[PDB]
Design a protein around this ligand. Sequence first.
Ligand SMILES: [Ca+2]
Lengths: 171, 172
Amino acid sequence: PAYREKYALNLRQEFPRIPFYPEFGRWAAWGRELMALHIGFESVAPYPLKRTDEPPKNDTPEALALAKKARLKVQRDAAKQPTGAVELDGLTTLAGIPAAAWAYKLGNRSALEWVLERHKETTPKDATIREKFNTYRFADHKERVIDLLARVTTVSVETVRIVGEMPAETM
Amino acid sequence: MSLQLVKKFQKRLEDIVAYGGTRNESSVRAAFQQLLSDWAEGSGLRLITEVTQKAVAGNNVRPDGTLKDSLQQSRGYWESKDEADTLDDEIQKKLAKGYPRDNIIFEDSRLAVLMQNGEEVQRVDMGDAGALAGLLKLFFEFEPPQVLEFRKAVDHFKDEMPHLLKILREAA
Ligand SMILES: [Ca+2]
């Protein structure tokens, strides 16, 4: 974190030059853990997330259809801070995400918010693909996402911890 | 009916967006309201607007208009939308709230969908008079299976009266 803060304007205009930090052993260890979590994010232990399920509003065939549509939104409080719940679709809602897991910010979006965004049903900009090759329904990918969100919750909380164990000063 | 009434509707839809400067549903609905109303008058039905019905869920829902009979019995419904919306998208939400589907004309100013017995029977373009006049014929004539079976029993008599008259003539 401190390297990213101090040399921020440098990082923004050049290739990231690497300091010769005192220990080395500790640093390459921290980086063996980090790379494991990031590469094998499909194999990390799923964090325990509480799945709660609600029935459709009525029994109209259209209610179910409209409720199987993806919302994938972080339920936030009035302070616009995550309440630790994600409304997956109108029926399934996963909860119990730790607050620290929202801090593995890869870009302007957290790791979890990236998984949610890239699994939403967005209309293809190309017309031909919109008309003929638009066959993604979140229903078919709901279970896989429930698993990925849990695995990435572990990646996020583990990364935030390893990054917090790092010194508070840059060579 | 048919051509005469539908062609007057086409001119009235134009007069509304021209003299009013609004293409909003609340203003442009008067055109199809008067088509459905004047057709009904001739078929012994009346289009009563904004009549609240209850769904299975218990949700009160008010279609733009219902086709009532002389015994206050609903026989068809109508919902108008503006041209500035996707008719098909508004259709799922409408029926999800608890809208009827036995006989309902979902209609925006450019396209008309007739849903009978729960399935889309016909989808016409309101620009084509003959096409709309066809869909409206099926809407105003859709009958519940009770009257469908009575009509069939009246036809049975047309080939049973000879057999019945023999018995009465033999008695006379
Ligand atoms: Ca309406």
